[PDB]
Amino acid sequence: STGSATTTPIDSLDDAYITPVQIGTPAQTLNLDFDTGSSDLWVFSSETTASEVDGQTIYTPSKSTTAKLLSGATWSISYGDGSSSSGDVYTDTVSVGGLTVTGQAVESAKKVSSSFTEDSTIDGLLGLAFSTLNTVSPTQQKTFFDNAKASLDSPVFTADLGYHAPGTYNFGFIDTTAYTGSITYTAVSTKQGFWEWTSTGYAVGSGTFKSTSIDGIADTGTTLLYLPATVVSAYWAQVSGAKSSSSVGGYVFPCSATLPSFTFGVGSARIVIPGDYIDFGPISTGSSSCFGGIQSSAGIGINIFGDVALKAAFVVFNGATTPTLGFASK
Numbered sequence: 104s105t106g107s108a109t110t111t112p113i114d115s116l117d118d119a120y121i122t123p124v125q126i127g128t129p130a131q132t133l134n135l136d137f138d139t140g141s142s143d144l145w146v147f148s149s150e151t152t153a154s155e156v157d158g159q160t161i162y163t164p165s166k167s168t169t170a171k172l173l174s175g176a177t178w179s180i181s182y183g184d185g186s187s188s189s190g191d192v193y194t195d196t197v198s199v200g201g202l203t204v205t206g207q208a209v210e211s212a213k214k215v216s217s218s219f220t221e222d223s224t225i226d227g228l229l230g231l232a233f234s235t236l237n238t239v240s241p242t243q244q245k246t247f248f249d250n251a252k253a254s255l256d257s258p259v260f261t262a263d264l265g266y267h268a269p270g271t272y273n274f275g276f277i278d279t280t281a282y283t284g285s286i287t288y289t290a291v292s293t294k295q296g297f298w299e300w301t302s303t304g305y306a307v308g309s310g311t312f313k314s315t316s317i318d319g320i321a322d323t324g325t326t327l328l329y330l331p332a333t334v335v336s337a338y339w340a341q342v343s344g345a346k347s348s349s350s351v352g353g354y355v356f357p358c359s360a361t362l363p364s365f366t367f368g369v370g371s372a373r374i375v376i377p378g379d380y381i382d383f384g385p386i387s388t389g390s391s392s393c394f395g396g397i398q399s400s401a402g403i404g405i406n407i408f409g410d411v412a413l414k415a416a417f418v419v420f421n422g423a424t425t426p427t428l429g430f431a432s433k
Contacts, residue, residue, distance in 0.1 A: 141228060173242075
């Protein structure tokens with residue numbers, strides 16, 4: 104089997120992407136944030152505290168003939184941005200882009216933090232990291248991808264995120280028309296539960312490539328590119344007027360400046376992030392100070408190849424017995 108679903112930016116900055124997912128019988132369609140940096144499929148629901156729901160579409164398990172309480176099971180998650188959610192669990196039929204999993208754990212939110220309430224466009228998350236990070240207790244649950252794997256034509260999914268435009272998540276096949284050149288594959292460590300890999304270096308604009316190992320995660324659920332402070336400083340030093348602002352919480356630059364591209368290494372291959380992808384617009388409405396799309400990872404504890412980086416590539420998440428990551432230009 105295979106599946107193919109379009110993913111769409113939630114706003115004009117590409118802050119996140121939503122993908123429609125069918126849950127239950129008859130189908131209830133929710134728009135979920137596909138997140139290769141976590142491993143829980145959770146949704147706003149009829150059980151979510153009413154005051155914490157503001158415009159989201161909710162899953163109502165009582166209206167699904169295929170929903171079953173996963174008795175005794177609870178979940179609770181916190182994300183890198185300080186947001187969180189928790190609740191109980193149902194199993195139900197879940198389909199993404201034509202690909203159906205029966206018995207998928209659907210984690211129903213009883214509580215969500217303010218960031219989720221305030222984002223009316225995101226009805227929940229669909230985790231695509233390794234199932235070892237799943238938070239369901241007492242019995243850890245498998246991700247949608249892990250459940251689908253044995254039925255898929257090939258044990259892979261791909262992320263083809265758009266710049267200020269829709270893109271695609273495919274399951275079970277590699278669309279050879281969706282990228283240019285070849286796909287370069289690189290080793291993954293699953294020791295932390297992430298799609299963790301090592302970039303071979305970077306270049307700023309037309310500058311010489313610096314060969315240096317950068318360990319990080321491929322995370323579709325993070326907006327920006329977070330790299331070591333040395334790398335990030337070298338980038339912003341090439342932007343007139345750029346500075347790190349502790350009041351704003353990162354590097355800002357005058358909206359009159361031209362942004363250089365940023366290249367990262369995948370083995371001997373190179374992915375070029377165009378300068379425009381690094382512009383996240385005014386820090387506040389009407390400001391001439393713009394927020395940068397490359398920021399320091401210092402104090403996160405991990406480097407994160409988020410959407411800024413991934414949307415510059417066609418990315419293969421290979422869940423074979425020995426997992427790997429593939430990157431192609433497009």
